[PDB]
Symmetry: C2
Subunit: 329 residues, 2 copies
């Protein structure tokens, strides 16, 4: 009681977040793209209706909150989010930060300037909205570019000032979390404020447990992503991998087994629109996982339960861990 | 009489364009940047006031029209343009196309899809505005990337369908215009519909005359850009060059001398806001050329006149050539 998190619809008690998906997207896009070329998505109205149907479905499966980790460079549209949230009756936490597609106007900025930009989105609001970010997203793909280091640092500085957490994109098989951790630690950020994302993209428990031992949250956030039985499509193969959802799901159990149940964050990394990819890739995705953001409660939790993970443990993972992570600290 | 060009304020007779700067910017930015972080520019209001003061000044010097060649990826804000145009009483033609900073949502698109995007901006309007583009901007920096080839082709296809002209960014010293020309010609575009930009960045008349002989318009569009007496600042040196404005201006005379007066387009490539660059670079620019978009009528035309270029020739360059270029053909 009495700790608050900013949502697209305004503030809520942390205790009201409930079953929370911590790495999600309404639309995966680019800044200004949705405004410029709505027809790409059929229409803006079509995209919203699809997101509402999707989020209604998640909600029926027990999801009460999602964190949309779309940054300015993922084409985050806070008005869209608010609209869909209201319609679906699902809370959405918005993000600041930057992903690996920053435009030059961002790439030319100093660490100080980036810090002011993240803070503005957190403390003041996004664009002219008044809608405040509840999280900061950052990214690497392998070893950090020099700009990427500035971003990670600005992210840490913003976090220290606000108590808002940081979440990351990684190339998991390259073990990016180790560098990201060092940089965050250099800025003095507590690891408990940090989630190392896409960690389910690897089965290297040495890497994962090492992070969890330091106190980092480990994001097992691409649960539905598999290219199996779609070995034809090269684009899909790179995007989705050859590991099954079950293989990915087992990692949650593996961590719990190693004593790290408190350090786990679980998600889909789903979206309802996808311009960042070739045009077919939305539909291919919907064929593979028609349950969308319902997948984790429908398929993952029962699988874990059948494997012996206790229901209270499952609750701690899906409710307590997000609540603790989100709570400005 | 009776040929029309689309402006941000609506259609105008071609004959009303008058003294026209064909390669300009209100703001050089990135998609959504101005919406997200207006404080970068002091405020949106500050940026507009500066643009109005600048364009008032140009107007007093005789400029009646400018073509803002800012694309979606240069952070073109058509509402801003309309506002400033109205206030300054200077016509602004808006652009479609893409520059060399396209986001992934664009980079993932097919040639067909790009063609539909350019056409939408031309035939329907930009964003939800109803404001139609009067020109298509495209770019290379050296030899074309494969995506850049698709863009050039989509640009040609849109042009053929509309009669709207194409203008380019080049790495002039690498002679990009020759490749760009070949691609446009492959798509069947007339060279008279095309301007090969930043051609004043080189003194290679062999390259320039070769283009002019084929019927291309040659854009001598960075007239005020010189780093001389600023040999300290490395950033400026790359951006502005070591050639004087006079050296750049002489090229106009050189072309006229070679019989190509009808093939010349003249400009500044100025802007009033600049996020695409490091933070100081706006102010450095304003110190060098306080006249802004007035520079060409103030300094360039008189220099040419003093060198013997006839006033009627100067008129043909600054009025007739733009009119002919802009007129949907
Ligand atoms: C395939 C989904 O990948 P991301 O989390 S990097 O974001 C793109 C929206
Ligand atoms: C220095 C001005 O360069 P550009 O024409 S490439 O556009 C940036 C606005
Ligand atoms: Fe994501
Ligand atoms: Fe330009």
């Amino acid at each position: 009681t009495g700790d608050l998190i900013n949502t697209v619809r305004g503030p809520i008690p942390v205790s009201e977040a409930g079953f929370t998906l911590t790495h999600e997207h309404i639309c995966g896009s680019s800044a200004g793209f949705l405004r410029a070329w709505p027809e790409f998505f059929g229409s803006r109205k079509a995209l919203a209706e699809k997101a509402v149907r999707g989020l209604r479905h998640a909600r029926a499966a027990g999801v009460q909150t999602i964190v949309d980790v779309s940054t300015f460079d993922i084409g985050r549209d806070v008005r869209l989010l608010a609209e869909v949230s209201r319609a679906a009756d699902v809370h959405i936490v918005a993000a600041t930060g930057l992903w690996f597609d920053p435009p030059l106007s961002m790439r030319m900025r100093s660490v100080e300037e980036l810090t002011q930009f993240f803070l503005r989105e957190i403390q003041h609001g996004i664009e002219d909205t008044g809608i405040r970010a509840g999280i900061i997203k950052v990214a690497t793909t392998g070893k950090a570019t020099p700009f990427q280091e500035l971003v990670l640092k600005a992210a840490a500085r913003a976090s220290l000032a606000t108590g808002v957490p940081v979440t990351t994109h990684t190339s998991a098989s390259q073990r990016d979390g180790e560098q990201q951790a060092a940089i965050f630690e250099s800025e003095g950020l507590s690891p408990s404020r940090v989630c190392i994302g896409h960690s389910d993209d690897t089965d290297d428990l040495s890497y994962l447990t090492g992070l969890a031992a330091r106190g980092y949250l480990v994001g097992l956030d691409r649960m539905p992503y598999s290219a199996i039985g779609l070995e034809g499509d090269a684009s899909a193969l790179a995007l989705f991998g050859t590991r099954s959802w079950q293989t990915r799901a087992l990692l949650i159990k593996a961590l719990i087994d190693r004593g790290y149940k408190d350090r786990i964050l679980v998600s889909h990394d789903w979206l309802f629109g996808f311009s960042l990819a070739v045009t077919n890739i939305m539909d291919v995705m919907d064929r593979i996982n028609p349950d969308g953001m319902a997948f984790v409660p429908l398929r993952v939790i029962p699988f874990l339960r059948e494997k012996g993970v206790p229901p209270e443990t499952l609750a701690g993972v899906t409710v307590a861990n997000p609540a603790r992570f989100l709570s400005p600290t």
